Amino acid sequence: EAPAAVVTGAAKRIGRAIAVKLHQTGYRVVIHYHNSAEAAVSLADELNKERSNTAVVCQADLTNSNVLPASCEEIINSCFRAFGRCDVLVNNASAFYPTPLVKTVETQVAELIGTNAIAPFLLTMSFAQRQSNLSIVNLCDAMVDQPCMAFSLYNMGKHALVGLTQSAALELAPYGIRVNGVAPGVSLLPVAMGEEEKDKWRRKVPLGRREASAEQIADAVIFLVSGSAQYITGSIIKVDGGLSLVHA
Amino acid sequence: MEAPAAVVTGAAKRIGRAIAVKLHQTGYRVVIHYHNSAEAAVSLADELNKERSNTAVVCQADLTNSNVLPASCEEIINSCFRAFGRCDVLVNNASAFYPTPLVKTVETQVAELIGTNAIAPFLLTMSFAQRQNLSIVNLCDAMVDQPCMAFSLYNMGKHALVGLTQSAALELAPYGIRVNGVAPGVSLLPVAMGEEEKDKWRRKVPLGRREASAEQIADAVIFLVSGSAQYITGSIIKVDGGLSLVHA
Amino acid sequence: APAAVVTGAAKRIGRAIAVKLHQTGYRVVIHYHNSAEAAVSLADELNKERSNTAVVCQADLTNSNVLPASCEEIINSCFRAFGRCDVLVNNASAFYPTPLVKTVETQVAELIGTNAIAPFLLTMSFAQRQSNLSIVNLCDAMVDQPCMAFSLYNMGKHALVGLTQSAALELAPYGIRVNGVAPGVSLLPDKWRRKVPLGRREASAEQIADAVIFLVSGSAQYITGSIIKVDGGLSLVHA
Amino acid sequence: EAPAAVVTGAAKRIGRAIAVKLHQTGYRVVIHYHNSAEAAVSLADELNKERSNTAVVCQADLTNSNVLPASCEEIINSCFRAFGRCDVLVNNASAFYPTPLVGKTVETQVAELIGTNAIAPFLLTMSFAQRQSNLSIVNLCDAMVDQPCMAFSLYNMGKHALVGLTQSAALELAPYGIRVNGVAPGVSLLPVAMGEEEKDKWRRKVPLGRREASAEQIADAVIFLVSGSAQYITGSIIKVDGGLSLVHA
Ligand SMILES: NC(=O)c1ccc[n+]([C@@H]2O[C@H](COP(=O)([O-])OP(=O)(O)OC[C@H]3O[C@@H](n4cnc5c(N)ncnc54)[C@H](OP(=O)(O)O)[C@@H]3O)[C@@H](O)[C@H]2O)c1
Ligand SMILES: NC(=O)c1ccc[n+]([C@@H]2O[C@H](COP(=O)([O-])OP(=O)(O)OC[C@H]3O[C@@H](n4cnc5c(N)ncnc54)[C@H](OP(=O)(O)O)[C@@H]3O)[C@@H](O)[C@H]2O)c1
Ligand SMILES: NC(=O)c1ccc[n+]([C@@H]2O[C@H](COP(=O)([O-])OP(=O)(O)OC[C@H]3O[C@@H](n4cnc5c(N)ncnc54)[C@H](OP(=O)(O)O)[C@@H]3O)[C@@H](O)[C@H]2O)c1
Ligand SMILES: NC(=O)c1ccc[n+]([C@@H]2O[C@H](COP(=O)([O-])OP(=O)(O)OC[C@H]3O[C@@H](n4cnc5c(N)ncnc54)[C@H](OP(=O)(O)O)[C@@H]3O)[C@@H](O)[C@H]2O)c1
Ligand SMILES: O=c1c(O)c(-c2ccc(O)c(O)c2)oc2ccc(O)cc12
Ligand SMILES: O=c1c(O)c(-c2ccc(O)c(O)c2)oc2ccc(O)cc12
Numbered sequence: 001e002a003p004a005a006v007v008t009g010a011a012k013r014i015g016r017a018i019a020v021k022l023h024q025t026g027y028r029v030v031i032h033y034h035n036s037a038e039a040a041v042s043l044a045d046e047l048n049k050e051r052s053n054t055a056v057v058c059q060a061d062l063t064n065s066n067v068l069p070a071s072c073e074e075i076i077n078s079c080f081r082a083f084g085r086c087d088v089l090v091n092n093a094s095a096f097y098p099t100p101l102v103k104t105v106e107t108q109v110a111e112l113i114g115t116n117a118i119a120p121f122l123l124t125m126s127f128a129q130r131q132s133n134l135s136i137v138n139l140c141d142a143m144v145d146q147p148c149m150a151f152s153l154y155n156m157g158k159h160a161l162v163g164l165t166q167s168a169a170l171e172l173a174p175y176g177i178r179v180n181g182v183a184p185g186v187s188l189l190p191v192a193m194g195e196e197e198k199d200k201w202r203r204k205v206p207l208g209r210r211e212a213s214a215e216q217i218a219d220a221v222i223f224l225v226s227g228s229a230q231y232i233t234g235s236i237i238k239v240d241g242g243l244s245l246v247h248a
Numbered sequence: 249m250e251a252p253a254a255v256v257t258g259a260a261k262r263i264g265r266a267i268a269v270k271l272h273q274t275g276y277r278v279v280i281h282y283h284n285s286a287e288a289a290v291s292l293a294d295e296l297n298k299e300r301s302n303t304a305v306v307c308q309a310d311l312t313n314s315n316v317l318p319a320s321c322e323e324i325i326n327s328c329f330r331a332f333g334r335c336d337v338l339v340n341n342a343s344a345f346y347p348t349p350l351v352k353t354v355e356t357q358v359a360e361l362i363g364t365n366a367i368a369p370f371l372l373t374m375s376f377a378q379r380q381n382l383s384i385v386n387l388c389d390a391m392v393d394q395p396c397m398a399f400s401l402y403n404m405g406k407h408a409l410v411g412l413t414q415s416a417a418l419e420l421a422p423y424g425i426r427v428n429g430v431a432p433g434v435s436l437l438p439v440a441m442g443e444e445e446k447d448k449w450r451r452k453v454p455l456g457r458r459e460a461s462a463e464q465i466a467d468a469v470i471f472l473v474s475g476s477a478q479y480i481t482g483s484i485i486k487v488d489g490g491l492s493l494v495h496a
Numbered sequence: 497a498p499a500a501v502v503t504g505a506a507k508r509i510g511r512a513i514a515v516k517l518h519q520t521g522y523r524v525v526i527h528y529h530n531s532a533e534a535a536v537s538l539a540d541e542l543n544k545e546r547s548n549t550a551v552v553c554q555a556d557l558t559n560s561n562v563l564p565a566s567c568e569e570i571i572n573s574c575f576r577a578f579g580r581c582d583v584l585v586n587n588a589s590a591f592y593p594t595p596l597v598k599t600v601e602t603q604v605a606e607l608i609g610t611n612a613i614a615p616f617l618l619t620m621s622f623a624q625r626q627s628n629l630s631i632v633n634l635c636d637a638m639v640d641q642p643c644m645a646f647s648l649y650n651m652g653k654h655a656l657v658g659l660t661q662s663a664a665l666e667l668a669p670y671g672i673r674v675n676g677v678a679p680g681v682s683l684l685p686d687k688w689r690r691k692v693p694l695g696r697r698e699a700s701a702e703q704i705a706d707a708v709i710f711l712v713s714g715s716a717q718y719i720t721g722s723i724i725k726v727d728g729g730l731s732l733v734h735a
Numbered sequence: 736e737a738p739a740a741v742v743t744g745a746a747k748r749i750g751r752a753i754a755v756k757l758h759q760t761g762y763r764v765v766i767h768y769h770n771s772a773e774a775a776v777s778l779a780d781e782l783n784k785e786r787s788n789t790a791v792v793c794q795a796d797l798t799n800s801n802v803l804p805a806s807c808e809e810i811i812n813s814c815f816r817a818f819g820r821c822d823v824l825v826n827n828a829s830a831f832y833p834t835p836l837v838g839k840t841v842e843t844q845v846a847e848l849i850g851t852n853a854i855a856p857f858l859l860t861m862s863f864a865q866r867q868s869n870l871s872i873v874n875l876c877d878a879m880v881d882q883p884c885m886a887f888s889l890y891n892m893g894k895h896a897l898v899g900l901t902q903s904a905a906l907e908l909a910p911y912g913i914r915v916n917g918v919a920p921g922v923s924l925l926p927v928a929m930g931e932e933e934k935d936k937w938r939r940k941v942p943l944g945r946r947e948a949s950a951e952q953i954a955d956a957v958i959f960l961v962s963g964s965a966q967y968i969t970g971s972i973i974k975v976d977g978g979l980s981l982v983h984a
């Protein structure tokens with residue numbers, strides 16, 4: 001049959017464009033979501049109208065806790081249950097908010113380190129334990145070495161995700177599983193953000209003075225899972241329009 | 249009084265101990281944090297106090313991630329203020345290190361490896377900064393991008409530590425607190441480790457075919473806390489004998 | 497139909513790159529220094545597929561007082577043949593040891609000239625003469641764990657990373673993207689094969705070219721200053 | 736006897752501060768210079784008046800050419816001729832100016848910006864090692880090499896090559912006991928011709944104190960790397976940039 005993929009946080013924005021584009025490439029998809037139940041079911045309905053029985057949703061909180069490993073095991077299990085295989089994992093879900101050094105701190109750690117680093121690691125474990133062109137793509141951050149002031153925990157999580165991309169690429173290569181990253185600079189700006197601030201950020205991008213479309217991020221993800229990336233593992237592709245190259 | 253004070257985590261033994269000794273030799277009063285090594289911590293404090301009265305205290309604390317970790321970290325920093333009326337230097341040296349293959353429960357492994365290596369340093373950094381030649385030195389790892397097989401969680405935590413070193417340096421620079429790292433390659437080898445195994449590692453180091461002494465690592469810490477590094481923040485000094493330059 | 501220049505295109509990786517660009521519908525300049533018969537054989541094979549879509553261009557890419565003119569000429573040949581030049585692939589490369597303990601200045605001319613200076617000059621000519629415009633530079637995934645006694649080669653490849661970033665920044669306003677592909681062990685010039693995590697073998701040249709094709713494509717329209725490793729995980733492996 | 740050091744471009748600015756700190760630590764120094772003759776002799780006179788016969792000057796163009804290997808050989812020779820040894824090499828000399836992609840010919844820009852920043856360090860490294868305790872080489876790198884100034888491609892190329900050299904040499908020279916490390920300023924002494932207004936624009940970007948590194952602060956990191964406190968450090972590049980390289984656009 002057709003291969004299958006899990007995309008975490010796939011209801012909206014970049015995760016949705018990634019699930020759409022995998023689906024358009026021939027993949028059956030698990031649409032993982034946390035709070036965005038309506039958007040998720042909507043996407044699965046649209047994908048299923050195009051090719052019947054090719055999309056499911058799977059709800060899970062990816063905050064760190066003692067039950068996080070079971071939740072991650074269940075995300076992967078949902079793929080096998082719906083499609084009998086799981087070829088691609090996309091770790092796209094992410095918590096993102098400031099945690100100034102100067103919600104309790106335990107919750108902020110559980111959320112930002114959970115979603116960005118620990119859930120990826122556990123999903124990777126469960127993915128590998130259940131196992132052709134198998135691969136995992138982690139959504140990293142091109143700006144990880146030029147961080148946003150007061151985003152220590154978020155930054156820590158994405159740095160840990162780089163660590164994971166490298167470590168898992170090394171350890172899973174003998175099982176023919178490739179592990180890579182796509183690192184957006186500025187792509188879809190936060191919903192909460194005002195328009196003058198959105199423009200502040202746009203104007204900094206060398207290539208076009210505009211943020212990445214979700215489809216442009218998805219395009220790198222498609223490349224990495226594709227047959228044209230069969231010798232690529234442990235690589236992180238910046239998709240940032242040059243933004244990481246720009247000095248203060 | 250007028251002598252500065254430093255907290256060193258995991259200071260009972262090995263590198264942390266050498267760091268505590270060297271700081272004390274430089275004129276610092278020291279909090280010797282420990283987890284299980286009470287006898288070692290106390291004997292070091294007694295030796296330091298014999299050299300100069302009332303210049304060393306111990307502080308016991310588990311740095312595993314949990315609900316209570318922020319309160320523990322707060323209490324470590326407090327201990328230095330209670331003992332010495334000031335806290336000039338934080339050395340995040342304590343570390344759990346053991347394999348976590350992708351293919352103790354896993355949530356415990358996460359708590360210990362990510363708590364000690366990343367979360368506890370972040371919480372100690374918050375408490376250090378909130379309580380204020382101030383600086384923080386984090387013990388990193390030079391081999392973080394060429395990691396040992398099946399050490400993904402340990403690798404994640406040490407990458408997260410780089411992230412913290414960079415984020416905290418940027419955020420704390422307005423308060424005049426510098427944040428840097430020392431990244432050993434192979435230093436003191438495991439206790440139980442066979443000499444034939446230790447030699448395999450030693451033979452890989454270009455500079456002298458030997459591991460760094462604990463004092464060599466401490467020397468880079470002393471530099472970073474010193475007036476000779478007053479413009480240095482966000483930097484990670486490898487102290488690895490060229491090990492990280494050696495291809496497979 | 498867009499047009500591409502590939503340097504060192506007569507053999508091995510540049511050949512695979514030329515063929516793949518051509519197969520994607522580019523017209524191609526096949527640059528060569530000493531490999532005339534091979535360049536022409538490739539041009540003949542590509543012109544049989546689609547006539548008048550492949551030309552050859554001779555140039556020495558050694559650093560010298562005339563390298564700027566040779567680089568200008570390479571870019572010119574594309575514009576002459578095809579009336580446009582959409583893609584520059586800096587693939588040509590000298591590779592050999594230069595122990596710290598051929599004259600040294602010839603080794604500088606070859607190893608730094610071919611690997612870094614010619615890419616710089618070709619970049620200037622390509623830019624001056626100017627849509628999906630991009631430059632791809634063939635980098636090296638093992639640049640930070642360099643081979644023993646290869647200082648000048650490593651210098652040249654680090655300089656090439658510097659150029660990829662600087663040019664991506666400077667040319668972004670012109671809509672010219674500048675990226676890198678960094679092979680590990682590809683076509684050898686068993687022990688090395690054994691060290692590679694992904695399948696204990698070298699990259700074929702086509703695997704390298706696949707990354708080049710992605711980077712020049714519409715699927716990479718937001719990508720500039722990026723270097724894609726294509727090394728099977730070799731650069732992750734410690735000593 | 737006292738150890739001896741060669742500092743390239745040592746008449747003024749950071750190079751001078753490194754030679755002065757080396758000298759105050761007990762080194763004998765070769766003050767290399769290219770055009771700054773008065774400033775070089777003046778520095779050696781001041782250093783010799785502190786301790787006799789402890790400083791010499793040495794003139795050379797470090798621009799790339801077929802004679803550059805001889806000039807570099809001669810710099811290192813000058814240390815042996817003066818002091819009987821050469822313990823430390825500081826590659827500090829640097830040409831710095833824009834070379835936009837879209838007076839001097841391009842071949843001259845390549846020769847100066849690549850020559851001074853990368854080829855001369857490589858040739859001086861070869862000579863220093865071939866002419867051979869705590870031996871080391873320190874290369875002055877650039878903390879902002881990955882976030883480069885617009886239109887400085889050749890300069891950036893040169894400094895990237897210098898990183899490459901630092902790593903390759905550290906690795907190849909480790910068996911000889913020679914350490915090779917880098918110190919990478921962000922903004923330290925501003926260019927003499929830069930207006931205060933532009934200087935303050937750069938100052939204001941530095942997280943740690945909104946000011947440039949002093950020459951002494953750069954020199955302090957050099958001193959560290961040559962000292963017994965860094966006897967296990969090779970192939971490391973220490974940023975001394977007050978956080979500048981961490982600041983996003
Ligand atoms: N957007 C950018 O410019 C940019 C820049 C750098 C990196 N990135 C990275 O690119 C990826 C996609 O970016 P984005 O802006 O599309 O992401 P986003 O909208 O900020 O988040 C994507 C989804 O993650 C899920 N999520 C958040 N907390 C969660 C939790 N505790 N448990 C489970 N899921 C949770 C949410 O799902 P529900 O909606 O279902 O609750 C959310 O829709 C992310 O990993 C992000 O860090 C983006
Ligand atoms: N030695 C090396 O070659 C090497 C290589 C790379 C990086 N490093 C880094 O350099 C630093 C020092 O190295 P090392 O070899 O001296 O360290 P170590 O001996 O592995 O550990 C240092 C101390 O960490 C403390 N620790 C462990 N788990 C803890 C927990 N849950 N709570 C609180 N403390 C805990 C222990 O204290 P008690 O003994 O009191 O329980 C231990 O003695 C570490 O950060 C390490 O990761 C070392
Ligand atoms: N093969 C690998 O595993 C590997 C590993 C790391 C990096 N790379 C990089 O990948 C790229 C292509 O690799 P490759 O192995 O296919 O390259 P290669 O066979 O070593 O050389 C490619 C072409 O460069 C041209 N060339 C060499 N010196 C020249 C000069 N002075 N003037 C003009 N042209 C010159 C030659 O053209 P003529 O034949 O026409 O004389 C040669 O066929 C290179 O940039 C290389 O450094 C490859
Ligand atoms: N200043 C900063 O903020 C900063 C920032 C990043 C990196 N750096 C690096 O730090 C080092 C010191 O910086 P600086 O500002 O003190 O350097 P600088 O004043 O710009 O240059 C130092 C010396 O380089 C020598 N030099 C220039 N071209 C030469 C040639 N063709 N041959 C031989 N020598 C030549 C000159 O000697 P004469 O005077 O004798 O002609 C000059 O005094 C340099 O390597 C620089 O690239 C500095
Ligand atoms: O929406 C986001 C965003 O615009 C940005 C963003 C905005 C402006 C920037 O300069 C930048 O580097 C990131 O970052 C995110 C990181 C994680 C995530 O889940 C969402 C965002
Ligand atoms: O003791 C350790 C060690 O020898 C090594 C080590 C030994 C051999 C290696 O080749 C290496 O890269 C690290 O790593 C550690 C990391 C953390 C820690 O807390 C202790 C050690």
Ligand SMILES: O=c1c(O)c(-c2ccc(O)c(O)c2)oc2ccc(O)cc12
Pocket residue numbers: 829830831879921922923924925926937
């Ligand atoms: O003087 C220099 C300078 O201020 C700077 C400089 C000034 C402002 C900046 O933001 C910066 O990144 C570098 O760079 C140099 C690089 C080489 C050199 O030889 C001298 C200088």
